[PDB]
């Protein structure tokens, strides 16, 4: 079976170098070129180029030239994407492909998310959020959990060990000083709080911090 796996999420800093690996299976490696496609932070897919594999020849898209590279290893069927002088604007997801030439490809790579930032590994600030009188609308009391300033991704935010997923919305996090801030809100009826325990469980194995915070009434 043809399945393209890549190096996983990579943590980088501006000014360094990286070689992004693409490991291929199900076919002879030198027989298919590797189409490299960058996904811009705005979710634009920007095509990096294709490497003639035989012959080991990279073909760059002009915008990607001279700070990027395509290198290969034939025996283990691993294609490599080399990047020099890392830049924060390069934070993105990268992809490889098994070449069907001018019709492109039938199989997409697993993807590689490069993160170029200059933070310190940090545990999140996990705050139980007490709803006020105006926060109780329509028989339900909405509760929330602020996850503030954690690096790196991901964080597992559950509620009462994940026992109640009903009204749980775990929102994405964006960059603040290269730190991530997200919030998660559980929606339970007003009869369940503060009658029943509601505790947001934030598991951040990257910083090795599992935080448990219960919301208390005011």
């Amino acid at each position: 079976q043809v399945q393209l796996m890549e190096s996983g999420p990579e943590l980088k800093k501006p000014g360094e170098t990286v070689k992004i690996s693409c490991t291929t299976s199900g076919y002879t490696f030198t027989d298919y070129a590797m189409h490299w496609v960058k996904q811009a932070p705005g979710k634009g897919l920007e095509w990096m180029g294709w490497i003639n594999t035989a012959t080991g020849e990279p073909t760059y898209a002009y915008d990607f030239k001279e700070r990027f590279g395509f290198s290969l290893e034939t025996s283990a069927s691993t294609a490599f994407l080399q990047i020099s002088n890392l830049k924060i604007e390069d934070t993105a997801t990268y992809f490889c492909a098994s070449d069907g030439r001018y019709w492109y490809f039938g199989v997409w790579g697993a993807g590689t998310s490069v993160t170029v930032s200059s933070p310190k590994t940090t545990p999140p600030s996990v705050y139980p959020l007490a709803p006020v009188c105006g926060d109780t609308t329509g028989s339900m009391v909405t509760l929330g959990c602020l996850v503030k300033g954690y690096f790196p991704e991901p964080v597992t935010v559950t509620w009462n060990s994940g026992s109640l997923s009903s009204g749980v919305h775990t929102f994405p996090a964006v960059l603040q000083s290269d730190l991530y801030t997200l919030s998660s809100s559980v929606t339970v009826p007003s009869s369940t709080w503060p009658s029943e325990t509601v505790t947001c469980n934030v598991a951040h194995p990257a910083s090795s911090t599992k935080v448990d915070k219960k919301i208390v009434p005011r």
Binding site: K43, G44, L45, W47, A61, Y62, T93, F95, Y102, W103, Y104, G106, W108, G109, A110, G111, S125, Y127, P128, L129, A130, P131, V132, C133, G134, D135, T137, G138, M140, T142, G144, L146, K148, G167, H169, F171, P172, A173, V174, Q176, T181, L182, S183, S185, T187, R218
Partner: protein, 215 residues
């Protein structure tokens, strides 16, 4: 040399109704050489139509389309919840090979008003020196929405952090979380905090307010 754009960029339509994407290619007479990609956010796409008449292996028969030269189409008569994704397309003949500004499928439902809950910063954050006032907008449809942080009746755009999800898997609505970040001293020098949420459903912004002097 060729410019590609896909429209409508966001299409709200119920499952089973036909969706015909109006699409074009600037550099003309591509012959056919036009494709279609469906990509959910945070994933690689999947090639839908090649030869403009023909599916790939995994893509089911519900996908179709036609065109030549400039204009091309993606016609899915039985759109489905599995079809929810960001539709992409890409060109051949000349080089370099490039794509179009994409188009979103959205499954249509009844317009829903947001559930707005504005939480004062925790006592743990105040002791940390900062104060982040969060505003949760849950289960609203469509995605068009706005948050305005009114401090003592005056709107503040500073420290506003807006985190909203995509179209949900369960109810297919949108959920938004707005965050107003301040310092504790700046938090204690301002009294009334409210996030007014205007939406296509409610002709007036939904106002959830609290004051530090109140509770």
């Amino acid at each position: 040399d060729i410019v590609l754009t896909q429209s409508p960029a966001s299409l709200a339509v119920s499952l089973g109704q036909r969706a015909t994407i109006s699409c074009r290619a600037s550099q003309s007479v591509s012959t056919s050489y036009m494709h279609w990609y469906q990509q959910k956010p945070g994933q690689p796409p999947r090639l839908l139509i090649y030869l403009v008449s023909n599916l790939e292996s995994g893509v089911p028969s519900r996908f179709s389309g036609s065109g030549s030269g400039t204009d091309f189409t993606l016609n899915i008569h039985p759109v489905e919840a599995e079809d929810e994704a960001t539709y992409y397309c890409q060109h051949i003949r000349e080089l370099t090979r490039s794509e179009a500004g994409p188009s979103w499928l959205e499954i249509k439902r009844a317009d829903a008003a947001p559930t707005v809950s504005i939480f004062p910063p925790s006592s743990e954050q105040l002791t940390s020196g900062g104060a982040s006032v969060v505003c949760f907008l849950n289960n609203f449809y469509p995605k068009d929405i706005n948050v305005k942080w009114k401090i003592d009746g005056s709107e503040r755009q500073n420290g506003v952090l807006n985190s909203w999800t995509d179209q949900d898997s369960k109810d297919s609505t949108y959920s938004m979380s707005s965050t107003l970040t301040l310092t504790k001293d700046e938090y204690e020098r301002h009294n009334s905090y409210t996030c007014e949420a205007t939406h296509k459903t409610s002709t007036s912004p939904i106002v959830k307010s609290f004051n530090r002097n109140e509770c």
